[PDB]
Amino acid sequence: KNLVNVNLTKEMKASFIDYAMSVIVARALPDVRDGLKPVHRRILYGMNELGVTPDKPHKKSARITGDVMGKYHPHGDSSIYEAMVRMAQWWSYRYMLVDGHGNFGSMDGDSAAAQRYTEARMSKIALEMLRDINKNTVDFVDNYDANEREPLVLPARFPNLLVNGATGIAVGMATNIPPHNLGETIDAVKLVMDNPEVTTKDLMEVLPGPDFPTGALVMGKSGIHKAYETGKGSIVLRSRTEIETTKTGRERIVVTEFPYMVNKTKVHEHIVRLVQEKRIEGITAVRDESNREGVRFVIEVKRDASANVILNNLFKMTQMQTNFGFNMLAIQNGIPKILSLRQILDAYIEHQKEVVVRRTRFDKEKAEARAHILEGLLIALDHIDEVIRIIRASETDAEAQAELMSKFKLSERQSQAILDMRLRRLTGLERDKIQSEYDDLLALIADLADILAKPERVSQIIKDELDEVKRKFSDKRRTELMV
Amino acid sequence: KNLVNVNLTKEMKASFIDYAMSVIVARALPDVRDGLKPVHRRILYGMNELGVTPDKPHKKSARITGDVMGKYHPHGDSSIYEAMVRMAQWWSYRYMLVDGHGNFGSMDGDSAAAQRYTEARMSKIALEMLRDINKNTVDFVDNYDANEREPLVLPARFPNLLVNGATGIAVGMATNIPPHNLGETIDAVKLVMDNPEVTTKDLMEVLPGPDFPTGALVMGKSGIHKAYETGKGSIVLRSRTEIETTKTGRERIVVTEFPYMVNKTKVHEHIVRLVQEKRIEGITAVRDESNREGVRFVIEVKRDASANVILNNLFKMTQMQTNFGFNMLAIQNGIPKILSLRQILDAYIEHQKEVVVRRTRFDKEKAEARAHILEGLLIALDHIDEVIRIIRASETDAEAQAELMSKFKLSERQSQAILDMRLRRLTGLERDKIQSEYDDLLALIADLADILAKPERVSQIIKDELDEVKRKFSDKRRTELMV
Amino acid sequence: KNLVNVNLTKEMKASFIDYAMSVIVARALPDVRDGLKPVHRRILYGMNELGVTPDKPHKKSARITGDVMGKYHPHGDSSIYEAMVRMAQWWSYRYMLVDGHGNFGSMDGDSAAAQRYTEARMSKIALEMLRDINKNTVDFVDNYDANEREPLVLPARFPNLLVNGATGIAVGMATNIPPHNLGETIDAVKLVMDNPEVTTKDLMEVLPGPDFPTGALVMGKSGIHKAYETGKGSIVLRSRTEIETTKTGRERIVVTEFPYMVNKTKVHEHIVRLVQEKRIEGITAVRDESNREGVRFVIEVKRDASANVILNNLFKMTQMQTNFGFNMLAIQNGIPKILSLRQILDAYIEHQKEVVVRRTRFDKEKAEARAHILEGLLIALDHIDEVIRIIRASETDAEAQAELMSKFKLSERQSQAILDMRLRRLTGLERDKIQSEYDDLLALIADLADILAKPERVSQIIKDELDEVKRKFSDKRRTELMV
């Protein structure tokens, strides 16, 4: 009993809200608008600023995490590398945002040694997540070192919550992984953006549901319907098992698809233990006939035993048919909320409208500034002789630009462009190029103003780039929806 | 300052209550009704389900803790093994529930290396703690993997709070160890269950107080009386020291019983340091004349120095006579409360009444179902010819059992027993055995109904099994209550 | 979900206040009245009770931290040794309270191995911090082992907040380091204690501001004025850099003083990376021309590049000119408060008044007890014959002292001094010494009563001992206040 500091009412409330919000944000459930944890966001943005894209070969992950420590995220090195390892595995994570280089793990449960042993880089999907970031797309903030700037939320181009899910730590509130097939997800985005009232049955027509990174069988469409209506629910995960009867008589259970985030080795040891716990018999042996390649494993049922009985009993006991809860809890508008499939996609469509409007306004700013400078040079091309007469009558550059701005109503940018205009550009062979490019840039300004004026074309650009992503990446369901 | 999640009033209250209750339950003060921590409860129940009893030799503790991790308690492996080591030491813990096998520690303060170096099993007292568990005795719950079931509270057969105590971590609220002699405790339980108003002076007539695992001297019966009245108090722990005067002249302090959870080595180094801190003199030397066997240690006082002065001064300074607080704080009805010796034993007697009523109702269910089946076979033995006439007139087994249930008002269990009754059992040599066993089972049902009807016999069964435990285990006080 | 303990309203409030106050005190922001963390306070007091002063050579730090663990502070050994290492470095800490012995670290960022490899002791400033501690100066408390006593707040002799600063961990509330030059600080204390209303501009006349342990340049006197008025503010830290033009042409940036708690190696690697990040060019190379001795480092700017442009750009980008916040938050009266420079020094002057009054009352107690005993012996010297007549008429010592106290109105201390008075002291050659020493001790009592009666002399003693400290230690600013 050392500190005896008493008068701590509102200060314990403020410090408690601060430490709770720091838990919820930093080491807990991620955002709606990109589905990415802040550790993950700083991973992607730091590896963007290092430029470690798939044009270059893989770089040492220790340098990337050291730049994360020195710029964006001052926390555990092994925790940042844990996020690195979990992101860069095909079974741990559906679409590997980071493509790694070296031993990371196995489905049996394995870990890499440290951040200085293996390499990594961004995959083809992180370039999607970071395409059009540097263009006033999402507002930056100053981080803990007050010299670096980080993005608040990564400007996504595909809604990554439905793709990769949110694993959650409860300090009262935890959250789950509904994974999804990318192409059906994008089609669901299209149908929601077309009709503002689509029933969730008509999106279950679109979306089957859990597209696992290793495949499985999903039992229960009722729990699926409950989940994409209310947010809370549970489905059942039955492995892809089949009964194959030999001509000899000793039947066969071929198991090929253990469910989401379930060990192989622990389940097979649990099966052998349940043989030697002797509650039920009939299992002859287990053949684990692969080292790393191909997931198809034979467990034998003896002669004179219907293997569907053994199959139902291993589904009852083991981690081969489990429950799996859905609770789609994430940050919207700064608060954690349980949100539905409708609400996730409504918010994502609103965010892509924000992304498109900000990118379009940025390019209109850039082209408008260039057209402003080119208009100043065009006014210089209008009355060349008066400009030359003032330059010959000038004494300093400031006098020349001030008298040009006084005489032809010019800007500082315009007058600097005139006083830095090259004399070789004083020809009709150059006035043609300037005038044609000026009309082209005003045409581009009119096009971007038409984009900013009509929200239909906003949705059109969204549809086009989403279908581009769907062409570039969309596989189909490794998991079969059974009944 | 990363997460900026604002609207968190009731969610920070719910998450804060959740994390606080998870601290209080999991890593903090244990229960009234069995005195066992949830880590300890999962240790005992996992080692029960593995069957690692003293009929078998000791098994590797790593496998037990791995089964704890895979079934009941997903937390620190070294923390679970710390509970394993602390439970399985005679000086660290009064009655070793786990009997170990290998190097665990010393009273000097020593630790085992890991969970995969040494072995363990249950001792003779954990079989008491787990006797009659599988018989609807305490309701199970589903744990974090939703396939395993764990017990809420272990059905105790001796009140383990008073025996082993509760060490407590304060997040505002900590709790202490009153240990007790088992036989006097059981006699106190008997006298409380006999007279519902026994004064606490009359139970201090029964209970002396702290029965330490290594022995000591307890000063202060006033603090003892304060403790078993109100819960809060403190007693004084003076070591078993004696002054032995040599014929030569250089006197002797024989110290044999350091108090509860006090190091030997730190106290002897503190004594040598107090000699070389030179506040008071007269100590010649310290002889630590044992390696591991026998706790009797001689510290010499020189010629011309009364060793009672040195003895009072080492009691003033060192950790040889210390204070020791009592604050009997534990979970009753789901809340933590400071409870008295009366209240602990009233609650324990209520829990054993619950245990006895549930076990008696379970055995009445089992014998009643068997008597129901045997009554169906007895009705089959009544009119055998009509049953045979319907079986000969039957076409399917479902038809046969339906017509038997229609004709003689039978059950599905009764009709299956009749249609599976062996024809060799159709004799008067077999009707005698069935009728005699049927009357015996109805006699057992009448006996269990008499147990469920009269709470006197409930207390009688409690007295009998407690006195059985008292015969099987009760030693006496290694600690002397001095004045 | 293991513990299900519900009724926890006021108990979660009490446990939450307890764990929050334990964070704030133990592992967080330190006190006003000595500027020392409780870990640091237990370091200094434990090394005081071990007596490891600079009269003896350095002792092994593992023994000191082990005595800290065994007496005052039961927490992380590496955390206590982290406080040991940070305190005993000239660049990590302004005036090294602990003087160490061995490898501790570097400005590049280095750590010692453990507490058992290197040695330490108190420096010349910890003897100042612990001078007049054992004299009823600050009230002790009983610590966690109830046998040791520790000081609440160390009786400081120079205000250590302004000297060494308070680094803070936010659980909502963090705090910063304003370091100060000792001599100007003491002069500010003198001027505040003289005039109770000195304007903060007139103390910025006294106090320049941040006296860093390695030197720097401070930009912004406005933020300084904001800081010592309100507490919150920020100043800018520009390194001591200079542009030196070679006769060849390739200019030179000599950097000698990186700011407070900024790495060298990370900044030079950041500069080389910014060369290879290729945002701006002109830097030729970096020469790190020292191993450990002398901090003067040359970074080259190429021919035809004004190095003030490169200098402003490295100030914009790197950690060479940074921001630095001031938020003087510390414990006053048991609560954390943001306090101003006026308020820190008003509270420090009040604390030194408390120190002086308590020390003066202690020495008045000691001299008054000695004068009481000497007055009893003086009354014995008055009527020697009656005392001898009663001693000759006595039978026991208790009778003799009781009859002396009855006959001459004496005390137990006085009568024991008379009955233990040596007969050789019954001479006029000894009555002279007793009478002269008695008048001298009554003169000392009158002097201390004059100190306790007039607060002017209290401030005078404070001024004298502060100027003694200023003579013994005060260097000048390694940091230049630039504009």
mmCIF file of N, CA, C and O in Angstrom, chain B residues 129-192:
data_model
loop_
_atom_site.group_PDB
_atom_site.id
_atom_site.type_symbol
_atom_site.label_atom_id
_atom_site.label_comp_id
_atom_site.label_asym_id
_atom_site.label_seq_id
_atom_site.Cartn_x
_atom_site.Cartn_y
_atom_site.Cartn_z
ATOM 1 N N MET B 129 -12.581 -35.861 -2.223
ATOM 2 C CA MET B 129 -13.185 -34.683 -2.843
ATOM 3 C C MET B 129 -13.977 -35.017 -4.096
ATOM 4 O O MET B 129 -14.860 -34.247 -4.483
ATOM 5 N N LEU B 130 -13.676 -36.140 -4.736
ATOM 6 C CA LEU B 130 -14.318 -36.536 -5.977
ATOM 7 C C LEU B 130 -15.165 -37.788 -5.822
ATOM 8 O O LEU B 130 -15.673 -38.307 -6.820
ATOM 9 N N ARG B 131 -15.310 -38.301 -4.604
ATOM 10 C CA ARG B 131 -16.218 -39.414 -4.385
ATOM 11 C C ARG B 131 -17.643 -38.918 -4.534
ATOM 12 O O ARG B 131 -18.015 -37.899 -3.944
ATOM 13 N N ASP B 132 -18.422 -39.644 -5.339
ATOM 14 C CA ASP B 132 -19.795 -39.306 -5.710
ATOM 15 C C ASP B 132 -19.846 -37.925 -6.367
ATOM 16 O O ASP B 132 -20.358 -36.953 -5.818
ATOM 17 N N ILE B 133 -19.224 -37.859 -7.539
ATOM 18 C CA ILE B 133 -19.333 -36.695 -8.393
ATOM 19 C C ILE B 133 -20.206 -36.961 -9.614
ATOM 20 O O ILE B 133 -20.975 -36.081 -10.014
ATOM 21 N N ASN B 134 -20.195 -38.177 -10.149
ATOM 22 C CA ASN B 134 -20.784 -38.472 -11.442
ATOM 23 C C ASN B 134 -22.246 -38.854 -11.335
ATOM 24 O O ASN B 134 -22.749 -39.590 -12.189
ATOM 25 N N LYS B 135 -22.936 -38.374 -10.312
ATOM 26 C CA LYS B 135 -24.235 -38.895 -9.921
ATOM 27 C C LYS B 135 -25.222 -37.769 -9.678
ATOM 28 O O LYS B 135 -25.919 -37.756 -8.663
ATOM 29 N N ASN B 136 -25.269 -36.803 -10.608
ATOM 30 C CA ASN B 136 -26.142 -35.616 -10.543
ATOM 31 C C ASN B 136 -25.921 -34.840 -9.244
ATOM 32 O O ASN B 136 -26.850 -34.321 -8.626
ATOM 33 N N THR B 137 -24.671 -34.788 -8.805
ATOM 34 C CA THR B 137 -24.376 -34.235 -7.498
ATOM 35 C C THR B 137 -24.207 -32.725 -7.557
ATOM 36 O O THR B 137 -24.797 -32.000 -6.755
ATOM 37 N N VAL B 138 -23.395 -32.239 -8.488
ATOM 38 C CA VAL B 138 -23.280 -30.815 -8.768
ATOM 39 C C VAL B 138 -23.485 -30.622 -10.262
ATOM 40 O O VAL B 138 -22.947 -31.390 -11.068
ATOM 41 N N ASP B 139 -24.277 -29.612 -10.626
ATOM 42 C CA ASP B 139 -24.587 -29.339 -12.022
ATOM 43 C C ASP B 139 -23.343 -28.940 -12.803
ATOM 44 O O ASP B 139 -22.542 -28.116 -12.354
ATOM 45 N N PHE B 140 -23.181 -29.544 -13.971
ATOM 46 C CA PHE B 140 -22.107 -29.184 -14.873
ATOM 47 C C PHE B 140 -22.457 -27.933 -15.663
ATOM 48 O O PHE B 140 -23.610 -27.500 -15.725
ATOM 49 N N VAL B 141 -21.428 -27.341 -16.268
ATOM 50 C CA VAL B 141 -21.587 -26.292 -17.261
ATOM 51 C C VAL B 141 -20.709 -26.633 -18.455
ATOM 52 O O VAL B 141 -19.768 -27.423 -18.362
ATOM 53 N N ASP B 142 -21.032 -26.022 -19.586
ATOM 54 C CA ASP B 142 -20.205 -26.123 -20.777
ATOM 55 C C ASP B 142 -19.098 -25.086 -20.693
ATOM 56 O O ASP B 142 -19.356 -23.920 -20.382
ATOM 57 N N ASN B 143 -17.873 -25.506 -20.964
ATOM 58 C CA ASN B 143 -16.751 -24.588 -20.895
ATOM 59 C C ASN B 143 -16.513 -23.938 -22.259
ATOM 60 O O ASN B 143 -17.376 -23.948 -23.141
ATOM 61 N N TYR B 144 -15.328 -23.347 -22.422
ATOM 62 C CA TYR B 144 -15.009 -22.475 -23.548
ATOM 63 C C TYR B 144 -14.956 -23.206 -24.885
ATOM 64 O O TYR B 144 -14.968 -22.551 -25.931
ATOM 65 N N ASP B 145 -14.900 -24.535 -24.883
ATOM 66 C CA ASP B 145 -14.851 -25.321 -26.107
ATOM 67 C C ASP B 145 -16.175 -25.991 -26.444
ATOM 68 O O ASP B 145 -16.254 -26.681 -27.464
ATOM 69 N N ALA B 146 -17.189 -25.839 -25.587
ATOM 70 C CA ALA B 146 -18.583 -26.231 -25.821
ATOM 71 C C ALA B 146 -18.762 -27.721 -26.114
ATOM 72 O O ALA B 146 -19.781 -28.124 -26.683
ATOM 73 N N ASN B 147 -17.794 -28.553 -25.740
ATOM 74 C CA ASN B 147 -17.917 -29.999 -25.864
ATOM 75 C C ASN B 147 -17.606 -30.664 -24.532
ATOM 76 O O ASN B 147 -18.217 -31.674 -24.169
ATOM 77 N N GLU B 148 -16.653 -30.097 -23.802
ATOM 78 C CA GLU B 148 -16.347 -30.544 -22.457
ATOM 79 C C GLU B 148 -17.340 -29.949 -21.472
ATOM 80 O O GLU B 148 -17.894 -28.868 -21.689
ATOM 81 N N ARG B 149 -17.561 -30.665 -20.379
ATOM 82 C CA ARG B 149 -18.392 -30.183 -19.290
ATOM 83 C C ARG B 149 -17.544 -30.162 -18.032
ATOM 84 O O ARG B 149 -16.790 -31.104 -17.777
ATOM 85 N N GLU B 150 -17.643 -29.089 -17.265
ATOM 86 C CA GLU B 150 -16.904 -29.011 -16.020
ATOM 87 C C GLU B 150 -17.861 -28.815 -14.849
ATOM 88 O O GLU B 150 -18.991 -28.347 -15.027
ATOM 89 N N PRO B 151 -17.455 -29.196 -13.642
ATOM 90 C CA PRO B 151 -18.281 -28.910 -12.470
ATOM 91 C C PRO B 151 -18.155 -27.474 -12.004
ATOM 92 O O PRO B 151 -17.074 -26.882 -12.016
ATOM 93 N N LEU B 152 -19.295 -26.926 -11.588
ATOM 94 C CA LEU B 152 -19.336 -25.594 -11.001
ATOM 95 C C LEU B 152 -18.542 -25.540 -9.705
ATOM 96 O O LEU B 152 -17.602 -24.753 -9.567
ATOM 97 N N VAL B 153 -18.918 -26.368 -8.737
ATOM 98 C CA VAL B 153 -18.242 -26.459 -7.451
ATOM 99 C C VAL B 153 -18.028 -27.936 -7.140
ATOM 100 O O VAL B 153 -18.913 -28.756 -7.384
ATOM 101 N N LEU B 154 -16.832 -28.290 -6.695
ATOM 102 C CA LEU B 154 -16.562 -29.690 -6.407
ATOM 103 C C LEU B 154 -17.367 -30.141 -5.200
ATOM 104 O O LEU B 154 -17.405 -29.429 -4.193
ATOM 105 N N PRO B 155 -18.042 -31.278 -5.273
ATOM 106 C CA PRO B 155 -18.778 -31.761 -4.105
ATOM 107 C C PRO B 155 -17.810 -32.210 -3.036
ATOM 108 O O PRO B 155 -17.196 -33.275 -3.115
ATOM 109 N N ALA B 156 -17.658 -31.368 -2.030
ATOM 110 C CA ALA B 156 -16.690 -31.656 -0.997
ATOM 111 C C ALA B 156 -17.265 -32.655 -0.008
ATOM 112 O O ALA B 156 -18.479 -32.822 0.123
ATOM 113 N N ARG B 157 -16.373 -33.342 0.677
ATOM 114 C CA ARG B 157 -16.785 -34.184 1.775
ATOM 115 C C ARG B 157 -16.175 -33.736 3.083
ATOM 116 O O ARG B 157 -16.502 -34.303 4.128
ATOM 117 N N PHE B 158 -15.312 -32.731 3.058
ATOM 118 C CA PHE B 158 -14.837 -32.103 4.258
ATOM 119 C C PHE B 158 -14.656 -30.643 3.888
ATOM 120 O O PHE B 158 -14.267 -30.344 2.754
ATOM 121 N N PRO B 159 -14.960 -29.720 4.789
ATOM 122 C CA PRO B 159 -14.882 -28.303 4.428
ATOM 123 C C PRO B 159 -13.441 -27.832 4.310
ATOM 124 O O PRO B 159 -12.708 -27.710 5.295
ATOM 125 N N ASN B 160 -13.030 -27.572 3.072
ATOM 126 C CA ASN B 160 -11.629 -27.396 2.730
ATOM 127 C C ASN B 160 -11.137 -25.971 2.955
ATOM 128 O O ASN B 160 -9.921 -25.745 2.943
ATOM 129 N N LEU B 161 -12.047 -25.008 3.151
ATOM 130 C CA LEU B 161 -11.638 -23.660 3.539
ATOM 131 C C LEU B 161 -10.896 -23.673 4.856
ATOM 132 O O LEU B 161 -9.779 -23.152 4.955
ATOM 133 N N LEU B 162 -11.506 -24.267 5.877
ATOM 134 C CA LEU B 162 -10.891 -24.292 7.192
ATOM 135 C C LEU B 162 -9.633 -25.135 7.195
ATOM 136 O O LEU B 162 -8.702 -24.852 7.947
ATOM 137 N N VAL B 163 -9.563 -26.127 6.325
ATOM 138 C CA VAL B 163 -8.394 -26.984 6.290
ATOM 139 C C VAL B 163 -7.223 -26.283 5.623
ATOM 140 O O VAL B 163 -6.115 -26.247 6.165
ATOM 141 N N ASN B 164 -7.446 -25.690 4.453
ATOM 142 C CA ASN B 164 -6.332 -25.227 3.646
ATOM 143 C C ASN B 164 -6.243 -23.720 3.479
ATOM 144 O O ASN B 164 -5.184 -23.229 3.080
ATOM 145 N N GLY B 165 -7.311 -22.980 3.748
ATOM 146 C CA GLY B 165 -7.257 -21.535 3.700
ATOM 147 C C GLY B 165 -7.320 -20.978 2.292
ATOM 148 O O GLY B 165 -7.203 -21.684 1.291
ATOM 149 N N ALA B 166 -7.489 -19.661 2.223
ATOM 150 C CA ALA B 166 -7.614 -18.951 0.958
ATOM 151 C C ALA B 166 -6.629 -17.793 0.932
ATOM 152 O O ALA B 166 -6.817 -16.800 1.637
ATOM 153 N N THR B 167 -5.583 -17.909 0.128
ATOM 154 C CA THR B 167 -4.694 -16.779 -0.082
ATOM 155 C C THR B 167 -5.326 -15.817 -1.090
ATOM 156 O O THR B 167 -5.939 -16.244 -2.073
ATOM 157 N N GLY B 168 -5.229 -14.517 -0.818
ATOM 158 C CA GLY B 168 -5.983 -13.571 -1.617
ATOM 159 C C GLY B 168 -5.229 -12.435 -2.272
ATOM 160 O O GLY B 168 -4.321 -11.844 -1.683
ATOM 161 N N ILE B 169 -5.614 -12.121 -3.500
ATOM 162 C CA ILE B 169 -5.083 -10.976 -4.220
ATOM 163 C C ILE B 169 -6.096 -9.846 -4.135
ATOM 164 O O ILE B 169 -7.247 -9.997 -4.558
ATOM 165 N N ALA B 170 -5.667 -8.712 -3.590
ATOM 166 C CA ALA B 170 -6.529 -7.544 -3.462
ATOM 167 C C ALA B 170 -6.549 -6.771 -4.770
ATOM 168 O O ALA B 170 -5.508 -6.334 -5.268
ATOM 169 N N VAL B 171 -7.743 -6.594 -5.319
ATOM 170 C CA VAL B 171 -8.012 -5.512 -6.253
ATOM 171 C C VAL B 171 -8.928 -4.617 -5.423
ATOM 172 O O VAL B 171 -9.867 -3.981 -5.918
ATOM 173 N N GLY B 172 -8.657 -4.613 -4.117
ATOM 174 C CA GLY B 172 -9.449 -3.959 -3.103
ATOM 175 C C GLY B 172 -9.755 -4.927 -1.980
ATOM 176 O O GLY B 172 -9.999 -4.521 -0.841
ATOM 177 N N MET B 173 -9.753 -6.222 -2.300
ATOM 178 C CA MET B 173 -10.272 -7.258 -1.414
ATOM 179 C C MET B 173 -9.346 -8.465 -1.466
ATOM 180 O O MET B 173 -9.264 -9.135 -2.498
ATOM 181 N N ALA B 174 -8.653 -8.739 -0.361
ATOM 182 C CA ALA B 174 -7.802 -9.915 -0.220
ATOM 183 C C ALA B 174 -8.272 -10.755 0.961
ATOM 184 O O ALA B 174 -9.062 -10.309 1.794
ATOM 185 N N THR B 175 -7.760 -11.983 1.042
ATOM 186 C CA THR B 175 -8.263 -12.931 2.025
ATOM 187 C C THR B 175 -7.123 -13.807 2.531
ATOM 188 O O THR B 175 -6.089 -13.949 1.876
ATOM 189 N N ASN B 176 -7.333 -14.407 3.700
ATOM 190 C CA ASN B 176 -6.258 -15.013 4.477
ATOM 191 C C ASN B 176 -6.500 -16.499 4.729
ATOM 192 O O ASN B 176 -7.539 -17.059 4.377
ATOM 193 N N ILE B 177 -5.510 -17.119 5.365
ATOM 194 C CA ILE B 177 -5.454 -18.551 5.647
ATOM 195 C C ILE B 177 -5.710 -18.772 7.130
ATOM 196 O O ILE B 177 -4.789 -18.554 7.929
ATOM 197 N N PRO B 178 -6.914 -19.099 7.573
ATOM 198 C CA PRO B 178 -7.035 -19.855 8.818
ATOM 199 C C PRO B 178 -6.992 -21.350 8.550
ATOM 200 O O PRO B 178 -7.994 -21.943 8.125
ATOM 201 N N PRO B 179 -5.879 -22.020 8.825
ATOM 202 C CA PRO B 179 -5.878 -23.478 8.728
ATOM 203 C C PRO B 179 -6.451 -24.073 10.000
ATOM 204 O O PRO B 179 -6.563 -23.410 11.029
ATOM 205 N N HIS B 180 -6.848 -25.335 9.909
ATOM 206 C CA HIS B 180 -7.497 -25.976 11.043
ATOM 207 C C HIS B 180 -7.137 -27.451 11.089
ATOM 208 O O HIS B 180 -6.801 -28.062 10.073
ATOM 209 N N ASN B 181 -7.186 -28.005 12.294
ATOM 210 C CA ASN B 181 -7.045 -29.438 12.478
ATOM 211 C C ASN B 181 -8.326 -30.100 12.008
ATOM 212 O O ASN B 181 -9.417 -29.645 12.349
ATOM 213 N N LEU B 182 -8.185 -31.179 11.236
ATOM 214 C CA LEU B 182 -9.334 -31.785 10.573
ATOM 215 C C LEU B 182 -10.320 -32.385 11.564
ATOM 216 O O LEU B 182 -11.534 -32.223 11.409
ATOM 217 N N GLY B 183 -9.814 -33.063 12.593
ATOM 218 C CA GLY B 183 -10.698 -33.764 13.512
ATOM 219 C C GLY B 183 -11.512 -32.821 14.374
ATOM 220 O O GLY B 183 -12.721 -33.007 14.550
ATOM 221 N N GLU B 184 -10.861 -31.784 14.909
ATOM 222 C CA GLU B 184 -11.590 -30.771 15.661
ATOM 223 C C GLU B 184 -12.554 -30.009 14.770
ATOM 224 O O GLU B 184 -13.624 -29.600 15.228
ATOM 225 N N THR B 185 -12.202 -29.840 13.496
ATOM 226 C CA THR B 185 -13.092 -29.182 12.553
ATOM 227 C C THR B 185 -14.346 -30.003 12.334
ATOM 228 O O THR B 185 -15.459 -29.470 12.349
ATOM 229 N N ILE B 186 -14.177 -31.306 12.143
ATOM 230 C CA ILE B 186 -15.306 -32.200 11.937
ATOM 231 C C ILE B 186 -16.176 -32.266 13.183
ATOM 232 O O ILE B 186 -17.410 -32.276 13.095
ATOM 233 N N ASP B 187 -15.552 -32.246 14.360
ATOM 234 C CA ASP B 187 -16.324 -32.207 15.596
ATOM 235 C C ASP B 187 -17.076 -30.890 15.746
ATOM 236 O O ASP B 187 -18.203 -30.873 16.260
ATOM 237 N N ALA B 188 -16.486 -29.795 15.268
ATOM 238 C CA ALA B 188 -17.180 -28.515 15.262
ATOM 239 C C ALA B 188 -18.362 -28.540 14.312
ATOM 240 O O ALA B 188 -19.419 -27.981 14.617
ATOM 241 N N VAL B 189 -18.193 -29.190 13.161
ATOM 242 C CA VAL B 189 -19.290 -29.366 12.217
ATOM 243 C C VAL B 189 -20.416 -30.161 12.859
ATOM 244 O O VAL B 189 -21.596 -29.811 12.729
ATOM 245 N N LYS B 190 -20.057 -31.208 13.606
ATOM 246 C CA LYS B 190 -21.052 -32.027 14.290
ATOM 247 C C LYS B 190 -21.808 -31.228 15.341
ATOM 248 O O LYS B 190 -23.037 -31.318 15.432
ATOM 249 N N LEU B 191 -21.096 -30.414 16.118
ATOM 250 C CA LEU B 191 -21.765 -29.665 17.173
ATOM 251 C C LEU B 191 -22.611 -28.532 16.621
ATOM 252 O O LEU B 191 -23.668 -28.219 17.186
ATOM 253 N N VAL B 192 -22.185 -27.924 15.515
ATOM 254 C CA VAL B 192 -23.010 -26.910 14.874
ATOM 255 C C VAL B 192 -24.249 -27.548 14.263
ATOM 256 O O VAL B 192 -25.359 -27.011 14.367
#
